Design a protein around this ligand. Sequence first.
Ligand SMILES: N[C@@H](CO)[C@@H](O)[C@H](O)[C@H](O)COP(=O)(O)O
Ligand SMILES: N[C@@H](CO)[C@@H](O)[C@H](O)[C@H](O)COP(=O)(O)O
Ligand code: NA
Ligand code: NA
Lengths: 367, 367
Amino acid sequence: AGDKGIYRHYMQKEIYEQPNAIKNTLTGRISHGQVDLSELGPNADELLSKVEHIQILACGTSYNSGMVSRYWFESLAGIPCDVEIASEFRYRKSAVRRNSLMITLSQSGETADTLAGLRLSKELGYLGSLAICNVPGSSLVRESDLALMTNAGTEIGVASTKAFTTQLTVLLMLVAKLSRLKGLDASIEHDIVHGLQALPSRIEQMLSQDKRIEALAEDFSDKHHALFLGRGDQYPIALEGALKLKEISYIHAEAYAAGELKHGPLALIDADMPVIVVAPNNELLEKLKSNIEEVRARGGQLYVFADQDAGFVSSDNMHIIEMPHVEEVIAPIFYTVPLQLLAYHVALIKGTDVDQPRNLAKSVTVE
Amino acid sequence: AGDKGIYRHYMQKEIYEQPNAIKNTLTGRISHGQVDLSELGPNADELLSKVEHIQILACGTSYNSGMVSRYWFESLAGIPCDVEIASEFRYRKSAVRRNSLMITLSQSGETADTLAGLRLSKELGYLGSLAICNVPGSSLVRESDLALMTNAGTEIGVASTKAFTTQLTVLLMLVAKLSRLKGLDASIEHDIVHGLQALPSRIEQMLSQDKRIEALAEDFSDKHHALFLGRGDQYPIALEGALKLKEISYIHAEAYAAGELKHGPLALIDADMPVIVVAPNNELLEKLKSNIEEVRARGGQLYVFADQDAGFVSSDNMHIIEMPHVEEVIAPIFYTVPLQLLAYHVALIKGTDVDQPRNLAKSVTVE
Ligand SMILES: N[C@@H](CO)[C@@H](O)[C@H](O)[C@H](O)COP(=O)(O)O
Ligand SMILES: N[C@@H](CO)[C@@H](O)[C@H](O)[C@H](O)COP(=O)(O)O
Ligand code: NA
Ligand code: NA
């Protein structure tokens, strides 16, 4: 499988390779401050400029990356985007949108549900298909019209880390390139390229503070439940942080849109169910603190990952886990890191099988 | 709040009122075997025929009804449909679709997030708005262009039951009416009207077998977790059955698309986490049984709600909970019932506050 070097597990290694991985993914693609996707060929732009809707299919952690990207495609490139679990798409009769581009996200490029949604799509009237993948020569790559490799290097750990952040990096580059094809304000693209060029050092910063996440992991290591909350583009990061905690600690962690906490889940919260919040602004955190106060009688606690610049202050049931300020455009990618490290340190404390969590496999090559 | 008559709780009452409620919702709307929405006025059809995309906003149980309907709008009326949590829509910059109809679903008609998504939408370029609601003269009704009341009678129980099934009934009628405006095969509409006219007696049948659900409730009443799985149009019913179990039993029940069980959650399953499956076909059940077998060493068990006609047979770790055959078009509505009764009987056994579950309120009139 490969040399782990100084890391104890492939996953830890892959988490620490994120900066170099994202660097590698940017290589050849940034030319004079603009996204250069010329690796796609001379007719690529013709197709891309035709796109009026983007459809994304994937499973697991790859669906979570697609979900983040939808907020980018719509808010920044102004393009309608839908993301769907691959198995759900493949078994339903769908209404295909005018001039829709079909994108599949997959680390392995072999996931059966995703490969099937792609095969099916060819007969449904899509403008064409684009594979974002980390494995060259894999089926999803071979069978798509276009492919943008993430170039993260091989990922051996079953719970994906660098493949996810490099996927979001390729996605943001596509959003950039599409904002330009649509003749949208050039600042949209520059903000993205700048967020991207900073990203590697911003994660390297996040990594240097791993010891603080380790301490936090002690408060979750004996818990059997956890609720992860996020709003907008951080909603999917909360999805991804609960998936990672499920995957390698086996804790029953579920994600929720922050605004729906009150429409149900507050009834479950007690001391055995910590609530994590991913990069909330002030207005949202005020609501959440008011919600957690409703459950103080049961020891409800909020754990808030947030920009030190927001000025939030920890209280007895609200713990601010301060992070460096970072560019809004890349914040979803950056806030993933602490959630990967949290899951990893909980797994270490418990002594679970990080690189091969029970009953899971790197890629599900069967439907 | 009203006479409970012979029922112990408003919720139980509201669950047993479903047949009469759905009847009441169909009243005046079925004319010579076709959906008659003429209550909307003379220009309604002009607008509706213009629709090329449907956007639905709601929270909680109302979002779950919208999610079911998306599969109907796309598979039957051939119309692109997107459903979004109201809070998520209201805080993001979205890409509005060409000729999009905006629909809000709300029992109370006052939910702040949903009312806000509606207000915002007026300035975004939607063809117009339609409120499906159970409270007349409520804000969402007053402020929308069109409204289709569910006429379920008042719902006092905090966890919604008849408002949800009457919402899905109004939704299927709209799908029918739109298939006709698009000049689609007339059978689509007749299948729906027939499924609908049968529905009341089909639920009355489901209700007569309440004693069998009660027995099943004993197997969940001491559990702290539960995974609900569903595929396609039953995926949202699994969402709704896990929400109900969360709401009134306080058990940590989460729903998952059946095809993603393998992409994560299988690592969590043990004896303290029963897996429920909602109306799977043979192909899907074979996969799920193969998945549950992977976790036999930890006592993993599947509880399958399914058409007696499928011929499924119970085994030591797969319990078939047989149901009468029903028309495919209304199956999502019918399979909701047993999940409402399961939650209700678990709550009864535990002695939790069914009609006012801890920390919840009928409608969340604040954001
Ligand atoms: N390994 C898991 C992610 O941590 C799993 O959910 C994975 O994301 C899923 O199987 C999709 O795999 P793919 O990206 O290779 O398509
Ligand atoms: N009462 C709950 C449903 O059982 C809650 O989630 C509710 O669905 C949500 O508040 C939406 O309310 P509404 O339908 O009145 O808009
Ligand atoms: Na945001
Ligand atoms: Na189906």
